[PDB]
Design a protein around this ligand. Structure first.
Ligand SMILES: Nc1ncnc2c1ncn2[C@@H]1O[C@H](COP(=O)(O)OP(=O)(O)O)[C@@H](O)[C@H]1O
Lengths: 550, 78, 78
């Protein structure tokens, strides 16, 4: 039983090693401590191994990311397959061509990972039986498949979420056990010894809520480590949770535990000496604070034993993450106004508050702040918690963003979160100009859903002109075809072509109206002049050739 | 109208065509080792059908041409 | 028409001059009562739109056939 398990575990496999550890957990302790400790400390090192490269960025030795996604009869797809890039994948296409469905399916797949990380034997979301099943589909059921990769030990971790329609007359079952196994490893290893956990977040277009300035008071749930999994794959990230957590960090930084435990000890020392003679009535009803001294000792050992970061360090890390990604935000801090605590930011040298932000800055700020908070809570063993594993899905990354901000929305995100696999969808060529061609999966304009591969473009979009990306990749003309004035230059070219090159009456009229509309020094007029000059030169060449001989 | 560069400025590959021109002008319109290295980089990144290589080879051909012109002129100008 | 508001905790408050709008709308409403007339449409479509849409609106209280229901929540954004 263990004979081949030991050999396979030593070869770099943590499924067999985890099985050995689980089988030896309930065995006789004392003499077997070293045997089970070997398996535990090489499964934990499998998750915790990594180096710092020449750039100064920590790279895990076993990166976690999704490799393959297959959608069978899922919505408008008959059979669609995607190969996802390890670092960044962008899905582009026309309206109603998928994209959101793909991110939705990936989120429903990752929900099982999140749920089984949270609770033993947890259950994730499942496909809807009303809208997820493809219409006019003779099979009357749909399934989605995933092939996550978690290092050389686990080259593939299959998942299959399935669902059958109404009176399908048979029920398809989801095979979601390899996710349960991996998340069980993560959860139990974390329980025995704190380890860095991946972050699974989805950011739908439903993240444009107008913000509420009334913050629920800190009941004690936001600074729990497993609150980064609370509604993380649910569309909008919990920005209210971030605001509560940030204000809590500010209070714990301006208060700290070095100036609270000593005062409690001094109060105990004074009260005990006062009640030394007796008359313990002033200690019976004051025993509550003497017990709350021990309660403060509790919930404090976890802050030093788990190697969790200091509150000030977490606040500074989140501040640096927020300011370096949002172009307008220069500094963010918590101020006390009329007693209540509120968060204020700096927009272009002004000190507006959060609910005074625009829809473009506030949504991006909420996305970045939520992601940074989730990484900070889930990665306490890293010097830079933002360099942690995870899969983040973003729908319409350019939402509410000016074209100026779209030129630097990918670089900022990938420099703030280097090890996170970003799977995004976009509708803009300015974002595509900052992304390599290999990272793009495009839906063809003539696609009814029978196609079974999303392919990269055939032009290198990175570093290209806006017009080139808009024409070759997005397949939309540089000039609006519905405007009559946009075809004037082409008509002028045709008129110059059919004639001998001299400006006749029709070409002169066209040139006059082109000058009147676009302007004296517009690009259209300069192009018309260049065509006129080039046709004059062509006619001169023809005349010279004719005069040379017959 | 929007005050936005048509080609992103934060991408190092966007300045390669200009950085090329200079190399061909820093010399005398003529390809050499580093200019050929840059042209090979542009070939590998953008590709054959890309417009960037079309403009690069147009510049190469032109500068090879305004120098055969310069040649036929300085020879007769002494 | 002028809409004005003084800041919180300011002793001196500023009024709004909304009388002419009331007069024009009074003209519209009174003329409409005596003889039906075409009424203007005022609509705002903010970012607050694009929220998910499920058919959860049964007892929605208000009567959608009633002509003046076209002004209900018409400037809310969604
Ligand atoms: N059950 C279904 N059967 C068939 N087609 C569907 C079904 N559900 C959705 N669709 C179609 O699939 C598309 C879904 O749009 P979506 O995935 O959001 O695309 P995009 O993100 O590109 O706008 C729509 O065109 C819709 O008509």
């Amino acid at each position: 039983m263990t004979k081949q398990y030991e050999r396979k575990a030593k070869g770099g496999n943590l499924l067999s090693a985890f099985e050995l550890y689980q089988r030896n957990s309930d065995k006789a302790p004392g003499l077997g401590e070293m045997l089970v400790g070997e398996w535990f400390e090489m499964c934990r090192d499998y998750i915790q191994d990594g180096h710092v490269d020449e750039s100064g960025i920590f790279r895990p030795d076993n990166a976690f990311y999704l490799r393959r996604l297959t959608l069978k009869d899922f919505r408008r797809f008959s059979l669609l397959e995607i190969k996802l890039e390890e670092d960044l994948t962008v899905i582009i296409g026309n309206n109603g061509k998928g994209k959101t469905s793909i991110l939705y399916a990936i989120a429903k797949t990752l929900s099982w990972f999140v749920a089984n990380i949270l609770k033993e034997g947890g259950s994730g979301q499942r496909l809807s039986e009303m809208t997820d099943i493809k219409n006019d589909a003779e099979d009357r059921y749909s399934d989605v498949s995933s092939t996550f990769f978690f290092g050389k030990g686990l080259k593939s971790v299959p998942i299959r979420l399935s669902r059958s329609a109404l009176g399908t007359a048979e029920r398809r079952d989801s095979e979601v056990k390899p996710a349960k196994d991996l998340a069980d490893i993560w959860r139990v290893i974390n329980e025995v010894n704190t380890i860095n956990l991946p972050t699974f977040a989805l950011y739908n277009v439903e993240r444009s809520q107008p913000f509420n300035r009334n913050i629920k008071d800190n009941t004690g749930r936001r600074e729990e480590r497993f609150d980064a999994y609370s509604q993380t794959l649910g569309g909008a990230g919990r920005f209210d949770h971030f605001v509560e957590w940030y204000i809590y960090l500010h209070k714990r930084t301006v208060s700290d535990i070095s100036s609270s435990i000593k005062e409690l000890e001094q109060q105990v020392n004074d009260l005990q000496r006062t009640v030394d003679g007796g008359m313990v009535s002033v200690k019976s009803l004051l025993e509550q604070m003497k017990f709350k001294l021990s309660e403060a000792i509790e919930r404090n050992d976890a802050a030093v034993s788990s190697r969790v970061l200091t509150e000030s360090v977490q606040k500074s890390i989140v501040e640096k993450a927020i300011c370096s990604v949002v172009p307008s935000i220069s500094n963010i801090w918590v101020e006390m106004i009329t007693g209540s605590d509120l968060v204020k930011v700096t927009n272009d040298g002004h000190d507006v508050t959060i609910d005074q932000l625009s829809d473009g800055q506030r949504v991006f700020l909420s996305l970045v702040a939520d992601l940074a908070r989730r990484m900070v809570m889930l990665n306490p063993l890293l010097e830079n918690p933002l360099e942690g594993r995870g899969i983040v899905l973003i729908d319409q990354i350019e939402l509410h963003l000016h074209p100026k901000w779209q030129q630097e929305v990918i670089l900022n995100l990938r420099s703030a979160f280097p090890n996170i696999q970003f799977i995004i969808t976009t509708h803009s060529p300015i974002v595509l100009s900052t992304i390599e061609k290999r990272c793009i999966r495009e839906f063809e304009p003539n696609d009814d859903g029978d196609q079974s591969f999303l392919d990269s473009p055939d032009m290198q979009t990175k570093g290209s002109e806006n017009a080139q990306i808009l024409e070759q990749v997005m397949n939309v003309h540089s000039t609006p075809p519905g405007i009559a004035e946009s075809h004037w230059l082409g008509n002028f070219e045709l008129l110059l072509l059919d004639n001998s090159g001299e400006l006749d009456n029709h070409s002169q009229v066209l040139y006059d109206q082109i000058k009147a509309h676009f302007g004296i020094d517009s690009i259209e007029l300069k192009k018309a002049d260049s065509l006129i000059r080039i046709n004059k030169m062509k006619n001169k060449l023809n005349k010279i050739r004719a005069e040379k001989g017959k």
